[PDB]
A paper describes a structure:
To understand the molecular basis for substrate selectivity in xCT we determined the structure in complex with l-glutamate (l-Glu) to 3.7 Å. Glutamate was observed in the central binding site, with little overall change in the backbone (root mean square deviation 0.70 Å over 448 Cα atoms). However, in the structure of glutamate bound xCT we observe the density for glutamate ~ 3.3 Å further away from this canonical binding position, sitting closer to TM3 and 8 from the hash motif. The binding of glutamate closer to the hash motif allows for an interaction with Arg135 on TM3 through the gamma carboxylate group. Additional structural changes are observed in the position of Tyr244 on TM6A at the extracellular gate, which moves to hydrogen bond to the carboxylate termini, and Tyr251 on TM6B which interacts with the repositioned Arg135 side chain. Strikingly, the repositioning of Arg135 appears to induce a structural transition of TM8 from an unwound state in the apo structure, to helical in the glutamate bound complex. The structural changes in TM8 observed upon ligand binding suggest an additional mechanism for ligand specificity within this transporter and are consistent with previous observations of an allosteric mechanism in the LAT1 homologue BasC22. In the presence of l-glutamate TM8 adopts a conformation that induces structural rigidity to facilitate the positioning of the small ligand. Finally, when comparing the positions of the two ligands in our structures we observe that γ-carboxylate group of l-glutamate sits in the same position as the second carboxylate in cystine, sitting close to Arg135 and Arg369. Starting from our structure of the glutamate bound inward open state (i) we propose that ligand binding causes the allosteric transition in TM8, which facilitates glutamate recognition and closure of the intracellular gate, via the packing of TM1A and 6B against TM8.
Numbering used by the authors:
A (entry chain A): 168 to 214
B (entry chain B): 45 to 499
């Protein structure tokens, strides 16, 4: 509770920013990979 | 009265498993009538097990859920192995299976009459997992205000298959029921796989803590409510399956996937507006609940000291089970990217049903030794014994079937026995441990912004 005083310190939040930014970049990149797989996939010859 | 409890049980045991099981059930059964018999017997066994767990919950009265039952009757080691397998096999594989189904159903509208290029299934599945896990780690209030909507969609999804099935049945286009119990051989070896597929529709009977204080009149409310709930859910599931069989032939189901969208195509007109989206949302609902349950699991495991206390840890403010999602997400990624729905289901089912049967088998031992615990409800002798014997015997027979898939689960559940050295050891000699763990545990606690609940 009161023992996480070092979390509210400069640099530590920088590590959190970096980790979350890398996670979000990976998520957007893999979603874009899914999108390009779908788009470049064949378009279902019409019946 | 008891209506609210019945509603809770109904909403906790429906799940998305009814949209995954029928394909596998038919695949390893090869006969419509035998498949329906499999559904009925799985429902009966689920009712028996639910009664057994009701008796267990009433006879112990100690919080903890699945942990307490196994720990109390057997000892520390089976409980440790149970948590080990639940963390390493059961939860990640079940989540991966549900997520693969959700991804296939959400990609079906875009691929109307085609094949989804496998890899896109995994990517959309993983994206859904990531968004669900961050939503669970975002807030708990908004993760519950949406749970009611997901449950309502779950109720809506079953009607979309039930009512048109009723219309087809009343009009009597049932030409596949002329010889219900004949077809492909599908020798007895595949019966454990059929059985495994059978339960997963009834996923949610376990967990579901029933403390003997919420009910009005206990020891009659819990058994009656659970019996009616299993009865009506089994009736709904068998009606859903026969509705599926009204339009979808056995061959048209065997050489196909995502049976719901095939049913919609073969029966309804405009379909992508209703069936795929509703079933994808139904599969989305099961995603939210599991994270909270597995996070809760760690809370009781910290008292005995079987897992590091950081796993039952919580955020300072914006209270979410953050540390329990970062240890479960990568495992789910591993299973979904290195597993198949046919194999992951067996991988999870072998361990989960071995341990559930072992837990229920403790009822025979508990009732034979020291029969004085003020048992509120006395489940008869034959129910827990039959459930445990059938589960253990057929799980053991499942080793012969697809051995390369359950072998990993077996060696992991045997890995827990050596893994007890993390709990007993002479001197850890912190040159290669303890001190490194102290840096690691502190680093994770600082990075993830976690403080204990009230300890
Ligand atoms: N409840 C999940 C299974 C995972 C779990 O046991 O929490 C389901 O309906 O498939």
């Amino acid at each position: 509770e009161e023992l996480l005083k070092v979390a509210g310190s400069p640099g530590w939040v920088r590590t959190r920013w970096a980790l979350l930014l890398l996670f979000w970049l990976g998520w957007l990149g893999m979603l874009a990979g899914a999108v390009v797989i779908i788009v470049r996939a064949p378009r279902c010859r019409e019946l | 009265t008891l209506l609210r409890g019945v509603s809770i049980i109904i909403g906790t045991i429906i799940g998305a498993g009814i949209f995954i099981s029928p394909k596998g059930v038919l695949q390893n059964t090869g006969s419509v009538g035998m498949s329906l018999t499999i559904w009925t017997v799985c429902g009966v066994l689920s009712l028996f097990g639910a009664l057994s767990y009701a008796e267990l919950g009433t006879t112990i009265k100690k919080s903890g859920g699945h942990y307490t039952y196994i720990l109390e009757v057997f000892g520390p080691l089976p409980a440790f192995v149970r948590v080990w397998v639940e963390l390493l096999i059961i939860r990640p594989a079940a989540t991966a299976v549900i997520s693969l189904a959700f991804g296939r159903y959400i990609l079906e509208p875009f691929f109307i009459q085609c094949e989804i290029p496998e890899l896109a299934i995994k990517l959309i599945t993983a994206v859904g997992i990531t968004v669900v896990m961050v939503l669970n780690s975002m807030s708990v209030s908004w993760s519950a205000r949406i749970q009611i909507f997901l449950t309502f969609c779950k109720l809506t999804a079953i009607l979309i298959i039930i009512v048109p099935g009723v219309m087809q049945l009343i009009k009597g286009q049932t030409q596949n029921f002329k010889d219900a119990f004949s077809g492909r051989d599908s020798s007895i070896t595949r019966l454990p796989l059929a059985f495994y597929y059978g339960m997963y529709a009834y996923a949610g009977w376990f967990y579901l803590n029933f403390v003997t204080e919420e009910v009005e009149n206990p020891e009659k409310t819990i058994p009656l409510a659970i019996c009616i709930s299993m009865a009506i859910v089994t009736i709904g599931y068998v009606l859903t399956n026969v509705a599926y069989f009204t339009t979808i032939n056995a061959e048209e189901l065997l050489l196909s996937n995502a049976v719901a969208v095939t049913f919609s195509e073969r029966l309804l007109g405009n379909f992508s507006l209703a069936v795929p989206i509703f079933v994808a949302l139904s599969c989305f609902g099961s995603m939210n609940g599991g994270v909270f349950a597995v996070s809760r699991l760690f809370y009781v495991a910290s008292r005995e000291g079987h897992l590091p206390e950081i796993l039952s840890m919580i955020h300072v403010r914006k209270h979410t089970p953050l540390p329990a999602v970062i240890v479960l997400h990568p495992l789910t990624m591993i299973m979904l990217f290195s597993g198949d729905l046919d194999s992951l289901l067996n991988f999870l089912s072998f361990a989960r049903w071995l341990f559930i049967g072992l837990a229920v088998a403790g009822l025979i031992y508990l009732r034979y030794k020291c029969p004085d615990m003020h048992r509120p409800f006395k489940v008869p002798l034959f129910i827990p014994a039959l459930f445990s014997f059938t589960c253990l015997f057929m799980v053991a027979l499942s080793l012969y079937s697809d051995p390369f898939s359950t072998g990993i689960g077996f060696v992991i559940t045997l890995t827990g026995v050596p893994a007890y050295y993390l709990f007993i050891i002479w001197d850890k000699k912190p040159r290669w441990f303890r001190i490194m763990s102290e840096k690691i545990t502190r680093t994770l606690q600082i990075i993830l912004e976690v403080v204990p609940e009230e300890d």
